[PDB]
Each structure stands twice: as C-alpha cells, then as structure tokens.
Design an enzyme around this catalytic site. Structure first.
Site, PDB file in Angstrom:
ATOM      1  N   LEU A 185      19.471  43.611  37.609  1.00  0.00           N
ATOM      2  CA  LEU A 185      19.874  42.473  38.177  1.00  0.00           C
ATOM      3  C   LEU A 185      20.805  42.569  39.460  1.00  0.00           C
ATOM      4  O   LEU A 185      20.462  41.978  40.482  1.00  0.00           O
ATOM      5  CB  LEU A 185      20.461  41.652  37.120  1.00  0.00           C
ATOM      6  CG  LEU A 185      19.820  41.392  35.952  1.00  0.00           C
ATOM      7  CD1 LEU A 185      20.588  40.238  34.905  1.00  0.00           C
ATOM      8  CD2 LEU A 185      18.480  40.550  36.155  1.00  0.00           C
ATOM      9  N   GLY A 186      21.600  43.711  39.247  1.00  0.00           N
ATOM     10  CA  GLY A 186      22.595  44.004  40.272  1.00  0.00           C
ATOM     11  C   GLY A 186      22.877  45.354  40.385  1.00  0.00           C
ATOM     12  O   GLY A 186      22.834  45.876  39.316  1.00  0.00           O
ATOM     13  N   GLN A 189      28.796  49.825  43.649  1.00  0.00           N
ATOM     14  CA  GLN A 189      29.942  51.179  43.814  1.00  0.00           C
ATOM     15  C   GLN A 189      30.018  51.604  42.321  1.00  0.00           C
ATOM     16  O   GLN A 189      29.890  52.887  42.322  1.00  0.00           O
ATOM     17  CB  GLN A 189      30.612  50.693  44.577  1.00  0.00           C
ATOM     18  CG  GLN A 189      31.233  51.815  45.616  1.00  0.00           C
ATOM     19  CD  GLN A 189      32.538  51.276  46.676  1.00  0.00           C
ATOM     20  OE1 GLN A 189      33.268  50.608  45.883  1.00  0.00           O
ATOM     21  NE2 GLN A 189      32.508  51.724  47.566  1.00  0.00           N
ATOM     22  N   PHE A 190      30.240  50.939  41.380  1.00  0.00           N
ATOM     23  CA  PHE A 190      30.697  51.251  40.211  1.00  0.00           C
ATOM     24  C   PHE A 190      29.736  51.101  39.131  1.00  0.00           C
ATOM     25  O   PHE A 190      30.015  51.531  38.058  1.00  0.00           O
ATOM     26  CB  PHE A 190      32.112  50.447  39.895  1.00  0.00           C
ATOM     27  CG  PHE A 190      32.936  50.481  40.763  1.00  0.00           C
ATOM     28  CD1 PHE A 190      33.044  49.446  41.817  1.00  0.00           C
ATOM     29  CD2 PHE A 190      33.948  51.481  40.972  1.00  0.00           C
ATOM     30  CE1 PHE A 190      34.111  49.477  42.786  1.00  0.00           C
ATOM     31  CE2 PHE A 190      34.969  51.516  41.635  1.00  0.00           C
ATOM     32  CZ  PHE A 190      35.175  50.571  42.684  1.00  0.00           C
ATOM     33  N   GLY A 191      28.395  50.607  39.475  1.00  0.00           N
ATOM     34  CA  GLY A 191      27.561  50.757  38.132  1.00  0.00           C
ATOM     35  C   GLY A 191      26.419  49.749  38.582  1.00  0.00           C
ATOM     36  O   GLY A 191      26.201  49.247  39.837  1.00  0.00           O
ATOM     37  N   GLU A 192      25.730  49.246  37.437  1.00  0.00           N
ATOM     38  CA  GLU A 192      24.877  48.445  37.348  1.00  0.00           C
ATOM     39  C   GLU A 192      24.650  47.246  36.641  1.00  0.00           C
ATOM     40  O   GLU A 192      25.517  47.529  35.430  1.00  0.00           O
ATOM     41  CB  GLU A 192      23.331  49.408  37.195  1.00  0.00           C
ATOM     42  CG  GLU A 192      23.210  50.406  38.241  1.00  0.00           C
ATOM     43  CD  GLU A 192      22.113  51.310  37.917  1.00  0.00           C
ATOM     44  OE1 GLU A 192      21.679  51.301  36.671  1.00  0.00           O
ATOM     45  OE2 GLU A 192      21.680  52.091  39.030  1.00  0.00           O
ATOM     46  N   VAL A 193      23.975  46.215  36.693  1.00  0.00           N
ATOM     47  CA  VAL A 193      23.886  45.119  35.623  1.00  0.00           C
ATOM     48  C   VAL A 193      22.421  45.070  35.324  1.00  0.00           C
ATOM     49  O   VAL A 193      21.639  45.062  36.377  1.00  0.00           O
ATOM     50  CB  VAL A 193      24.514  43.879  36.067  1.00  0.00           C
ATOM     51  CG1 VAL A 193      24.252  42.766  35.284  1.00  0.00           C
ATOM     52  CG2 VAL A 193      26.302  43.961  36.223  1.00  0.00           C
ATOM     53  N   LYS A 207      26.230  45.842  31.608  1.00  0.00           N
ATOM     54  CA  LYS A 207      27.001  46.503  32.907  1.00  0.00           C
ATOM     55  C   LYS A 207      27.102  47.991  32.505  1.00  0.00           C
ATOM     56  O   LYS A 207      27.816  48.389  31.654  1.00  0.00           O
ATOM     57  CB  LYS A 207      28.388  45.970  33.079  1.00  0.00           C
ATOM     58  CG  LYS A 207      29.028  46.527  34.156  1.00  0.00           C
ATOM     59  CD  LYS A 207      30.211  45.790  34.552  1.00  0.00           C
ATOM     60  CE  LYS A 207      29.938  45.267  35.970  1.00  0.00           C
ATOM     61  NZ  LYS A 207      30.890  44.399  36.976  1.00  0.00           N
ATOM     62  N   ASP A 298      40.522  39.662  41.184  1.00  0.00           N
ATOM     63  CA  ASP A 298      39.248  39.687  42.180  1.00  0.00           C
ATOM     64  C   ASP A 298      38.448  38.289  41.831  1.00  0.00           C
ATOM     65  O   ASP A 298      37.024  38.155  41.649  1.00  0.00           O
ATOM     66  CB  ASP A 298      38.201  40.858  41.771  1.00  0.00           C
ATOM     67  CG  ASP A 298      37.144  41.134  42.829  1.00  0.00           C
ATOM     68  OD1 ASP A 298      37.526  40.578  44.155  1.00  0.00           O
ATOM     69  OD2 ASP A 298      36.172  41.766  42.513  1.00  0.00           O
TER      70      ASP A 298
HETATM   71  N1  LIG Z   1      26.266  38.577  32.014  1.00  0.00           N
HETATM   72  C1  LIG Z   1      25.529  38.321  32.928  1.00  0.00           C
HETATM   73  N2  LIG Z   1      24.384  37.608  33.006  1.00  0.00           N
HETATM   74  C2  LIG Z   1      23.261  37.235  33.686  1.00  0.00           C
HETATM   75  N3  LIG Z   1      23.433  37.582  34.784  1.00  0.00           N
HETATM   76  C3  LIG Z   1      24.567  38.463  35.135  1.00  0.00           C
HETATM   77  C4  LIG Z   1      25.501  38.891  34.367  1.00  0.00           C
HETATM   78  C5  LIG Z   1      26.579  39.681  35.126  1.00  0.00           C
HETATM   79  C6  LIG Z   1      27.647  40.417  34.542  1.00  0.00           C
HETATM   80  C7  LIG Z   1      28.846  40.351  35.381  1.00  0.00           C
HETATM   81  C8  LIG Z   1      30.127  41.047  35.120  1.00  0.00           C
HETATM   82  C9  LIG Z   1      30.123  41.672  34.020  1.00  0.00           C
HETATM   83  N4  LIG Z   1      31.324  42.209  33.752  1.00  0.00           N
HETATM   84  C10 LIG Z   1      31.902  42.634  32.653  1.00  0.00           C
HETATM   85  O1  LIG Z   1      31.376  42.413  31.526  1.00  0.00           O
HETATM   86  N5  LIG Z   1      33.175  43.261  32.528  1.00  0.00           N
HETATM   87  C11 LIG Z   1      33.692  43.538  31.519  1.00  0.00           C
HETATM   88  C12 LIG Z   1      34.771  44.621  31.119  1.00  0.00           C
HETATM   89  C13 LIG Z   1      34.312  45.797  31.222  1.00  0.00           C
HETATM   90  C14 LIG Z   1      35.417  46.879  31.163  1.00  0.00           C
HETATM   91  C15 LIG Z   1      36.667  46.320  31.169  1.00  0.00           C
HETATM   92  C16 LIG Z   1      37.059  44.874  30.950  1.00  0.00           C
HETATM   93  C17 LIG Z   1      36.108  44.263  31.007  1.00  0.00           C
HETATM   94  C18 LIG Z   1      29.124  41.818  33.157  1.00  0.00           C
HETATM   95  C19 LIG Z   1      27.919  41.216  33.342  1.00  0.00           C
HETATM   96  C20 LIG Z   1      26.029  39.958  36.120  1.00  0.00           C
HETATM   97  N6  LIG Z   1      24.800  39.191  36.467  1.00  0.00           N
HETATM   98  C21 LIG Z   1      23.888  39.254  37.612  1.00  0.00           C
HETATM   99  C22 LIG Z   1      23.941  40.809  38.365  1.00  0.00           C
HETATM  100  C23 LIG Z   1      24.487  40.446  39.911  1.00  0.00           C
HETATM  101  C24 LIG Z   1      24.919  39.190  40.095  1.00  0.00           C
HETATM  102  C25 LIG Z   1      25.001  38.436  38.727  1.00  0.00           C
END
Ligand SMILES: Nc1ncnc2c1c(-c1ccc(NC(=O)NCc3ccccc3)cc1)cn2C1CCCC1
Ligand SMILES: [Ca+2]
Ligand SMILES: [Cl-]
EC number: 2.7.10.2
Length: 430
Positions: A185-186, A189-193, A207, A298
């Site tokens: 989906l995305g 720099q720090f990884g992928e989703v 993620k 952020d």
């Molecule tokens: N959950 C989703 N569902 C559907 N679409 C999603 C997403 C996400 C998404 C965005 C941020 C995160 N970040 C996250 O879970 N961080 C958790 C974390 C990790 C380590 C320490 C503390 C918290 C996860 C998924 C991103 N995206 C799309 C992908 C690019 C734009 C939106």
C-alpha cells in the site's frame, strides 16, 4: 449461573470459538477479557465467544433502542450516519448526568437540515412530569404513537452495526507464517505497509520495519507499551512478528490516509461540517495522548487513517520515539523541544490541510522560505471556504509561546459543538 445473550450473529473462525445467532443464550464459564469461555444453550457446545457480542439477559443492552456508553456527540454521529431517517432514535447513558439516561432523536430543521436533538430522561421515568412511565420501553412506546412535545414522533431505533471481532486470544506474538502480505500500500525510508490476511480469515495491515539502530528487544518493549495505550481514535495494534525484520500487524483502515482520501473524488465531496467532524475525532485522539502525558511528534494528514465508515484514527503513535518541517513548531525545529504544545501547532497545520482538501502547507513556499517567514510572524492566510472561527482556532494553535496554545481537550470540545450553542445542547420542554 450467569446467562448472557447474543446481540449479533457471530460466525466462528478460530479453533475453539463458538458460532451463535442473535438471540442465543449461553452460560458463562470464564471471564478472560475480550474472549469469554461459554456454553451455548442452543447447541450445548463449549468454547470461546467475543465478550462484546453478548450482554446479560433482560438487561438494558439487550434492547434494540438502548446504546451503552455513547456520548452526546457520538449519538449525533450514529443517528446522522447512512441508513437512518426522521424519528430515528436511541436511549443511552447520560454523559453529564451520571447514572441516568438520555434520549436522542433525529429531526429535520428547515434552516440547517438534518439534526439530532437530545432530551434528558428524568428518573419510574419521565421527560415531562405529565407523562410518567414505569419502564423505558413504555416511554419509547408512548413517543412512537405521537410527538408529545418532542421535535419528532419516534420511528425506528438507530442503525447499529456489528462491533469488530476482537483479535485471536493469546496471539500478540505470531509466526510470520500466519500472514500473507497481499498488496503493498505504501513504501518509505523505514519500511513498508501492506494489505494482508492473517490465517486466511482476517484482513489486516502490516507495517514492515527495516533493521536499524533500534535494538530488537528495545523495539518490542516499546510496542508492548503502545499496546496498552489503546483508544477508539488510535489505530489498534493487533500483533507483532518479533523476528527481524519486525512486522507490526494493525487493523485495516479501508480508506487509507486522510491525505489521500481528501485528495480523492469521495473526499472532495465532503462538505465543511464533515471536515470539522474529522478534525474533532482527531482532536479527541490527541486529547487521550495529552491526558496520558505522552506526545505524538509527527501529526499531519498522512498519519491519520480513515475507516470504511469515515471514522478517523491517528496512526504511528509511538513510532517517533522508537526511531517534514512544514508541520513543526518553531521550538522543535530550532531546538529539540517536542511537547504536546508542539503537537498543537502541528494540529493547526493539519486543520488547514483538512479544509484545503489535502493541499500542501504554504503552497509555493519551501522549507527555508518558511522557517525565515515564521520568525517574521507570517501565518497561512484564511482559505476562501474556511469560517473565521475555525481560522482563529488555527491561529491559536500557531502562537509563538507554546504555553499560550490551547489544549486538545479544549480544541476537541470546541470542534465537537462548533455548530451548537451551549444553551442548545439539550432541549427544553414544559
Ligand atoms: N493500518 C492501515 N490500514 C490501511 N491502510 C494503511 C494502514 C497504514 C498504517 C499506518 C501506520 C502504521 N503504524 C503503526 O502501526 N505503528 C505502530 C508502532 C510500531 C512501533 C512502535 C510503536 C508503534 C500502521 C499501518 C497505512 N496505510 C496506508 C499505506 C500508505 C498510506 C496509508
Ligand atoms: Ca438547553
Ligand atoms: Cl447448562
């Protein structure tokens, strides 16, 4: 002997969970959090059930018109949601009169259009002293017959939808094998989703974390802290793959980021009250973080996700400490100082993003042009569609003195009732 009853149909998907239909009764064997061990009186089968899918027999939650723990604002949101109509109603716990109930009714006002009005229910029960009732069902039945002073004759209970299946029991740490990452989906720099399926039954987002200066065990103790800071307006963290590269498994938000959503066809059709509502929902999320003496660091529309139901949630809370200046407060660029007040500045910028349907902050300008312009005391002008009062919310977020920026607690309360005089929150009736 505790008998509960199903409020919705549930189809089993794990090894030891029970299927049941709406109305099925069951004996509770163990109260182990999100999953309870039960015995279905319909099937005689023993197994696990989602505790939020059931309620004690004949208690108020079993009623199709009762809504437990719903705030005045959330009542409005539900009643204004697709599928309802004139006279659609709910009885709910009173937010400001603890222990008591309130009635929320969907109405139509010529000037404004669809609205929700709220009546305090006086505990026997009554709204007016001339109409007293022994039960709430009696109460409901009377106002179904004719509007006895109410804005609208009661019709049909508010539409409810099935709550989300809670995550599999004892499955915080999972093997990578349980996942199929089906669609990127995305990427950054720090990884992928990725859009992903977990054990063939549950749609999730994953993620993927690129290896780094972050220590493996240090990264997990951080994630394990975030899992405890749960809130309705924060993306739910479901699971973790503890082996490098780290996978973080969260709920799937069907409409992606707020940024992309606003820059879309469906986004550009969202009228102004909708956008403010989005803003209020985010502010509520930030109010939780504020209360907990945490910081996001952020905040911007790319880190807000939108559900299929147009519910906005804050994403990436906590990733900042485990690891785009046009959203950053001066005392955080020029110095190292990040506080909740720096998030407030960022929220103000976010507020602008929302009203400008995704438009980049300071359009035409650039990072160095901006930092110097901030020291001047320049602020983005008010866009053509932004009300003066929303604009001065933004301006208050953009005070140079951090301590003069309002709280998210206050911002949320102003955005929530933006269109409602305090005196008009509840109705009066003789
Ligand atoms: N959950 C989703 N569902 C559907 N679409 C999603 C997403 C996400 C998404 C965005 C941020 C995160 N970040 C996250 O879970 N961080 C958790 C974390 C990790 C380590 C320490 C503390 C918290 C996860 C998924 C991103 N995206 C799309 C992908 C690019 C734009 C939106
Ligand atoms: Ca009033
Ligand atoms: Cl039994």
């Amino acid at each position: 002997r505790i008998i509960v009853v199903a409020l919705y149909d549930y189809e089993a998907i794990h090894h030891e969970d029970l299927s049941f239909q709406k109305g099925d009764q069951m004996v509770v064997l163990e109260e182990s959090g999100e999953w309870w061990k039960a015995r279905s009186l319909a099937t005689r089968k023993e197994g696990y059930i989602p505790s939020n899918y059931v309620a004690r027999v004949d208690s108020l939650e079993t009623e199709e018109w009762f809504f437990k723990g719903i705030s005045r604002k959330d009542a409005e949101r539900q009643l204004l949601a697709p599928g309802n109509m004139l006279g659609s109603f709910m009885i709910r716990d009173s937010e400001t009169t603890k222990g008591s109930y309130s009635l929320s009714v969907r109405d139509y006002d010529p000037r404004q259009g669809d609205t929700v009005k709220h009546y305090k229910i006086r505990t026997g029960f009554y709204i007016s002293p001339r109409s007293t009732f022994s039960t709430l069902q009696e109460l409901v039945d009377h106002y179904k017959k004719g509007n006895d002073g109410l804005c609208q004759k009661l019709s049909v209970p508010c539409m409810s939808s099935k709550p989300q299946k809670p995550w599999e029991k004892d499955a915080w740490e999972i093997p990578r094998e349980s996942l199929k990452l089906e669609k990127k989906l995305g990427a950054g720099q720090f990884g992928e989703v990725w859009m992903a399926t977990y054990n063939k039954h549950t749609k999730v987002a994953v993620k993927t974390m690129k290896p780094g200066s972050m220590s493996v065990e240090a990264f997990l103790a951080e994630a394990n802290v975030m899992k405890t800071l749960q809130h309705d307006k924060l993306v739910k963290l479901h699971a973790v793959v503890t082996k490098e590269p780290i996978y973080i498994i969260t709920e799937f938000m069907a409409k992606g980021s707020l940024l992309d959503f606003l820059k879309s066809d469906e986004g550009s059709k969202q009228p102004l009250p909708k956008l403010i509502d989005f803003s209020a929902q985010i502010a509520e999320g930030m109010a939780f973080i504020e209360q907990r003496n945490y910081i996001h660091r952020d905040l911007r529309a790319a880190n807000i996700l939108v559900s299929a139901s147009l519910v906005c949630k804050i994403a990436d809370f906590g990733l900042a400490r485990v690891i785009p200046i046009k959203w950053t407060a001066p005392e955080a660029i020029n110095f190292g100082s990040f506080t909740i007040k720096s998030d407030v500045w960022s929220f103000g910028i976010l507020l602008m993003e929302i009203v400008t349907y995704g438009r980049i902050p300071y359009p035409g300008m650039s990072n160095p042009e901006v930092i110097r312009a901030l020291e001047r005391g320049y602020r983005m002008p008010r866009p053509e569609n932004c009300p003066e009062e929303l604009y001065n919310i933004m301006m208050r977020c953009w005070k140079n003195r951090p301590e003069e920026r309002p709280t998210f607690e206050y911002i949320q309360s102003v955005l929530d009732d933006f269109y409602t005089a305090t005196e008009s929150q509840y109705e009066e009736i003789p």
